[PDB]
């Protein structure tokens with residue numbers, strides 16, 4: 348009823364949307380992995396009379412529910428989607444999107460890693476993002492490669508119209524006490540990559556993590572702290 352949704356307020360197999368700013372929503376879904384339940388976030392950005400989707404809802408059925416929730420709450424067509432790294436909470440559901448007529452995009456590095464690991468594979472390659480600090484425009488957002496962090500391929504997304512920074516899983520929520528799932532992370536480079544984000548988006552007003560509650564710029568420094576301490 349207004350608060351940011353958690354696993355406790357999302358019906359089973361359901362998706363909720365949360366208005367972040369004018370023409371910017373996050374989407375929140377729930378999924379089970381290795382016997383535990385987790386929330387995860389993505390982004391929706393108005394693209395004129397179309398919508399740009401950032402990341403799936405972690406699963407084919409979740410992502411079908413996501414499209415239905417978008418049509419119910421927003422009513423504009425999702426035409427393009429970007430996956431910010433190769434894990435299932437970012438690409439799981441790309442096959443559903445592609446069959447729905449959504450054009451799916453990711454960096455070549457993400458597409459390679461998804462294919463190698465048996466995850467669903469976005470159709471289109473996003474060039475110009477292979478060196479840390481690279482940035483390219485994509486409809487109403489800027490895509491930024493900060494360097495290796497939560498994964499070697501993780502991208503972040505900035506909505507300049509609203510100064511919204513979508514950090515993806517390279518950014519953790521403030522309540523985070525751990526670095527999350529670090530199976531594919533580079534703990535040594537992660538703080539340097541967060542520093543690049545901080546330097547590049549100093550005017551960010553909202554910071555959205557890959558999982559958990561949005562906040563302000565403090566999420567960036569907190570993420571660095573938790574990752575450095577995890578490594579220690």
Ligand SMILES: C[C@@H](c1cccc2c(-c3ccc(=O)[nH]c3)c(C(=O)O)[nH]c12)N1C[C@]2(C[C@@H](CN)C2)OC1=O
Pocket residue numbers: 380385434435436497516525526527528529530531557558
């Ligand atoms: C699908 C994703 C995933 C699954 C379950 C939980 C998480 C969390 C997380 C978030 C908060 C928290 O408190 N704990 C855990 C994150 C995260 O931090 O982004 N990712 C999760 N995967 C799977 C995988 C691939 C590898 C295969 N060998 C394992 O590495 C991942 O990042």
Ligand SMILES: [Zn+2]
Pocket residue numbers: 432434497498516
């Ligand atoms: Zn991940």
Ligand SMILES: [Zn+2]
Pocket residue numbers: 434436516557558
């Ligand atoms: Zn994640």
